[PDB]
Amino acid sequence: TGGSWFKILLFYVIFYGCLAGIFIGTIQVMLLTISELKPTYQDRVAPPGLTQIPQIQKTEISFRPNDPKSYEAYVLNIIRFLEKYKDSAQKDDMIFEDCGSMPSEPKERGEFNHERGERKVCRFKLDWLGNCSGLNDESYGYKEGKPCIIIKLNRVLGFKPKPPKNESLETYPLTMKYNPNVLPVQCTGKRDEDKDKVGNIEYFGMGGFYGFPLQYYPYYGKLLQPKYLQPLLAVQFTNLTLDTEIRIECKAYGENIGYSEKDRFQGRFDVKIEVKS
Amino acid sequence: MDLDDHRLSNTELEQKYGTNIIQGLSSVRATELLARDGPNTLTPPKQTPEIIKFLKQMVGGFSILLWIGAALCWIAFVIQYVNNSASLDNVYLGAILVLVVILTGIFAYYQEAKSTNIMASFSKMIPQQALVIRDAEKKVISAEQLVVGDVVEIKGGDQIPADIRLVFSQGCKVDNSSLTGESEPQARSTEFTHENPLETKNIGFYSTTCLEGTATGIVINTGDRTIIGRIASLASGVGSEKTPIAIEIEHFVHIVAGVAVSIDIIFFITAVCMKYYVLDAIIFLISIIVANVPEGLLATVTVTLSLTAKRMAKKNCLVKNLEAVETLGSTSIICSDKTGTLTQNRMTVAHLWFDNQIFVADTSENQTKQAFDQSSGTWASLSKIITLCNRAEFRPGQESVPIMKRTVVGDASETALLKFSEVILGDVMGIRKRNHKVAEIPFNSTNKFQLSIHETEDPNNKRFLVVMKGAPERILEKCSTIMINGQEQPLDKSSADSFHTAYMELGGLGERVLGFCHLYLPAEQFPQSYIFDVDSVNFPTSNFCFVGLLSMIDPPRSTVPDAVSKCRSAGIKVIMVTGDHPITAKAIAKSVGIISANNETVEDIAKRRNIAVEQVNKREAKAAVVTGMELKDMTPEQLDELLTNYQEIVFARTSPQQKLIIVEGCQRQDAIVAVTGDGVNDSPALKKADIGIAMGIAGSDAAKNAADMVLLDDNFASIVTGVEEGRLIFDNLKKTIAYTLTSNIPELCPFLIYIVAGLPLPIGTITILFIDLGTDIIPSIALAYEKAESDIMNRKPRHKKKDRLVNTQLAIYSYLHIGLMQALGGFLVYFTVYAQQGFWPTSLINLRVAWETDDINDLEDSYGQEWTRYQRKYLEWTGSTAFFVAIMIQQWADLIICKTRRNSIFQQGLFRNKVIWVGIASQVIVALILSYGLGSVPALSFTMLRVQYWFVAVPHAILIWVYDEMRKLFIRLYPGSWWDKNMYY
Ligand SMILES: Nc1ncnc2c1ncn2[C@@H]1O[C@H](COP(=O)(O)OP(=O)(O)CP(=O)(O)O)[C@@H](O)[C@H]1O
Ligand SMILES: *[C@@H]1O[C@H](CO)[C@@H](O)[C@H](O)[C@H]1NC(C)=O
Ligand code: NA
Ligand code: NA
Ligand code: NA
């Protein structure tokens, strides 16, 4: 009977409309507590993860230099990421500022407020990533057999890395360490045999320093600092044993930087490389 | 082994057993025999060991699903551990499932064992009595004290205590259903008839009851020696019965299991399509089955029965079947018997009618002789009739206490007449000794009179004095003359008018009236040596001499009127079916409340309007008083019409067959009937009725055996209490089912949202399993302890087919209101967690593919930050834990709102049921153990939660409570409206 069907359907219509209204109202009342500039908590992200650009599936880099298709995907991924680091895209001056090529103290651009609008960002030049920038050598070192991986630190909003103090040097001591404004990053062999057969490793950072400069921090969060360019570190493994499953572990050292056994990509990462013959 | 004295004559009985035929064995002989023979108790058969019941309880209900799920989880753990280390989570989940199924089985076993011990202990103190005769005196002793060789007298209604060889049977009929199989009246004869022990009628073989008459027997076998003890078939114990509530629950569990199977199949197909691991999808399948099925429902029904059995035990009652309570709670017609149930069953002579005059008497504490003169010839003849036709005898050895305190093992009316004759005249025993008796017909309901043949010792030696008593109307119709002033004269209209007006005066007080007459058989017709046969008519039964009437006070019980008022308030039709005259029955019904105030029958309407009875239409009369003959000559269609168109019905002058006809017609009206009876005449009605009720004291052994329930307190309010307990059982089961069905949607919905909208998985397999095993086991049991509401007995009886335990409206409510609201609260807390960590609600759309991609360790959130895969899986675990906590709090709200159906929580009380708070505290404990244990070390998709995430869903729980209270309030304020019709479950 339609006379009662209409009434019960009407009751259901108002009932579900009221339920949806309560749900939406509660969501909105929650969202007024959410800031658009600074996240409420950083429990899960505060220690930034350390990742690489080639974007390899199973933490494996497998390619034969003879066959271009073996490293075609890796080269395409690297160039696709590096498209935004070309000097053509950094030509603008209203948003991009040219800070010095020598590492310096982290620069504060103000508190996270809608006032002052969009902030300015330092420009990162590709020529600093020599031998792996692609400007001098297209397709990087995959043709010759000298793979390049670009190492980046995961973006954390309002994060200021603290490099290790001079008194306590957990990493390899260096005359050129320059700890006040460089976050050290070192790639070593995973185990004894890989350490023996890893070969020479050379690092390309700003001004020949090994790690991430500190003036590129803190990140302000895609709304005050869109088109942000995080510092990059290039690692080339030069000569390594052929037809060998070499495992490489790259680690970032610092006071804020932390490590966990559960998260294998927190403050460090693992790469497996075998160059087929 | 077949060695009996069936063919052996009565002469050897005295010599073989050394017991007298009448006096019997002496007390000293009984003492020595008791220490040598032993008690008369059958060997209790070994049914099943406790370990078998215990294992059955762990394999009873839905425990098979839990066992299979645990086995599959352990197999998956073994498979994944064969390859690599894998995760140590399937073994722990299986351990939890095994622990919970073991705990549920243990609880169910403990509850059913407690119920079984309670029912056995409260069905075992009732003793079987035997009327043994020792030293020419009869004393009532328990059947366990019976020995071999003694003489036992058994009449109608009492079960035969042992293998007795009958030596004196007067038309006695026995039911050999336990022996042969037939319930037909089997006549008994003293003479040896058949060579086979079973076929002969000179011996009864225990486990049988006498249908009518009296029988005297000699015990031959006791215990396992008798035929019923020889055969392995159980005389009593577990019968054949399946309660309709079991059918309803079994149908509900079947349909929910089927729907759960469809759901797990469809989710398993979708999960395989979405590229899950096979073992993971199988565990998800198992979680889908476990969550949907109502585990603990059988435990809940066991708890309800175990509680209500004890609740009726507090009211001093006996229930044979644990689930007869459910049938009693749905009773719509109560066919009660006036004498022995509605009244005190204690009676005293108060008024007497002879010589066209009503004589009053002192009810109690007379302390003086009667007012009326005893020298009158008419009263002397009446006293002689009372003394002769009566068979009652005072209890031997008790002639020191007053007359009323002395007990008799005969008819109650016979007892009262014996007391009156003893207090007004000399010893009745001496009169009976002087008046030699040759043959006598015991009172039977079919005849409605008692027939006796006596040898006259008067100078006018007629030698055959036929004295009868019984129904005044039949006796008057069988009498063509009445003695007035000691002189016989033909019956005239003046005597009839005086008798009728005196009878109305007696009946106006609700008193019972009996008729008494005598006649002297002529000497020419019957010589001194005459052979009398029961079948042969011989002496005429007509043209007797009327004498007068005697009135009998039968006061009712004090609490019966309140019980009747409650029953009529609950929509139960009370029908009085008695063998008394219509006038007294109507007076008693008016006094107690069977016939309501201002309610009148057709005769009352005709009297008050002074119009012809036939001219009066039948519709204006709301009450009727139907005689036995009118019902006897009444077709089934007419009886159905009579029961349909009348509110209050009183049946008078009824026979056992008439009671059976009434019961079967009331059944034909598709109504559940409860019949109360105490005598052997009530057995067919007791068996045919849906619920059988018998009196603890006034009831007979046959009535106790046939009844499905026994009132050891002998009050009508016990029936009201039993109906209330049944209604409470139905309400509590409905509440438990409604609560259980709520949580199905909060578990199924998140996976659907995950598949469709692409949000990261709001809930996992482990979290669904833990919600099931921590929110839908203990509270479901706790709802079985809920008390009855205030409107429990103000509701109409539920129709068997119209009203069902799980109707579609209950499922609609439980799924589409509470389930959806709980899911909305859980999703609110999920969105709160994700937004506070950095992922806004809009960014979570279609984020599923990138979320679980292990390749992407730099997922960009709404603020531009990059997230590692493990970090966002930890975020997923936190969201799942918050969803679990929200669902648990909303289940607290659902449990609060599910303990009532009409009244508010303020009327019922928040802390009345402490087991509700036990379950809530258990949920608090398990939530803390899950969030702070196994969350500090994140193993089972659980992590520690911040303090604010516990209180996010509290407003939604309060909203659930407010909405349910508003619905109940609008139902209460507007009964029978659209809201009441469509929003009531
Ligand atoms: N001991 C007795 N002696 C003589 N007449 C008796 C009697 N007991 C009953 N009657 C008569 O037999 C008639 C039939 O009544 P009946 O005995 O069938 O009612 P009832 O008392 O068995 C109903 P219930 O058993 O349910 O209380 C009555 O009218 C009564 O006068
Ligand atoms: C790296 O750069 C140096 C010059 O800075 C060059 O001599 C060398 O050949 C390069 N190595 C490779 C493997 O490209
Ligand atoms: Na369940
Ligand atoms: Na629930
Ligand atoms: Na459920």
Residue numbers in the entry:
A (entry chain B): 28 to 304
B (entry chain A): 52 to 1036
Reproduce text from the manuscript describing this model.
Here we study primary-active transport via P-type ATPases using functional and structural analyses to demonstrate that four simultaneous residue substitutions transform the non-gastric H+/K+ pump, a strict H+-dependent electroneutral P-type ATPase, into a bona fide Na+-dependent electrogenic Na+/K+ pump. P-type 2C ATPases are obligatory heterodimers formed by a catalytic α subunit and a auxiliary β subunit. The exquisite ion selectivity and stoichiometry characteristics of these pumps are determined by their ion-binding sites, formed between transmembrane helixes TM4-TM8 of the catalytic subunit.
Addition of Ala797Pro on the SWC template (SPWC mutant) generates a archetypal Na+/K+ pump. Due to the weak densities at sites I and II, the Na+ at site III is the only one unambiguously determined, while it is difficult to discriminate the other two Na+ from bound water molecules. The densities were interpreted by considering optimal water-cation distances, hydrogen bonds, electrostatic repulsion, and the need for multiple oxygens surrounding a cation. This results in a close overlap between the Na+ modeled in our structure with those in the NKA crystal structure (offset, respectively, by 0.5, 1.6, and 0.3 Å for sites I, II, and III). We found that TM5 pivots at site III, where the Na+ located on the extracellular side of Tyr790 is coordinated by side-chain oxygens from Thr793 (2.3 Å), Ser794 (3.7 Å), Asp827 (3.3 Å), Gln942 (2.5 Å), and Asp945 (3.5 Å) and by the main-chain carboxyl groups Tyr790 (2.8 Å) and Thr791 (4.2 Å), nearly identical to its coordination in NKA8. Coordination by the main-chain carbonyls of Tyr790 and Thr791 breaks the alpha-helical hydrogen-bond network of TM5. Interestingly, our Na+-bound E1 structure of the SPWC mutant has a water-filled cavity that reaches Asp945 and is capped by the α-subunit C-terminal tyrosine residues in the intracellular side.
